[PDB]
Amino acid sequence: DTLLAVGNPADLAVEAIRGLRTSLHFAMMEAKNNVLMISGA
Amino acid sequence: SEFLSGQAAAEMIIDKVEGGGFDYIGRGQIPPNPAELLMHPRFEQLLNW
Numbered sequence: 001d002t003l004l005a006v007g008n009p010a011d012l013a014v015e016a017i018r019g020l021r022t023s024l025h026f027a028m029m030e031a032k033n034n035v036l037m038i039s040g041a
Numbered sequence: 042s043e044f045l046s047g048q049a050a051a052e053m054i055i056d057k058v059e060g061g062g063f064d065y066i067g068r069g070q071i072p073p074n075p076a077e078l079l080m081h082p083r084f085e086q087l088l089n090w
Contacts (some may be wrong), residue, residue: 009074018076 042069044087045078051087 005014028036043049044066054066072078 015076 042072042075042078044069045081045083046072047083051090 004011005017008014024036028034044051044054054069055064056067058065078084
């Protein structure tokens with residue numbers, strides 16, 4: 001019940017999430033504001 | 042690493058290859074947060090200089 005990005009910062013999943021962060025830093029440009037909404041099916 | 046973390050200057054990192062003819066900057070000590078270090082603006086300052 002603790003964040004993976006804190007307990008094991010060198011896990012593969014956290015590396016993939018850092019890749020997602022770098023993707024977002026370019027995707028989230030020229031957006032009308034700085035709000036991100038993560039949803040699902 | 043020792044430059045990105047801020048505990049070194051831009052001049053003590055550059056060394057000369059013996060049988061080469063080009064300078065180089067080694068990684069240094071392995072950090073615990075590489076990808077988070079590389080985002081520091083000092084990296085861009087180093088490249089611009």
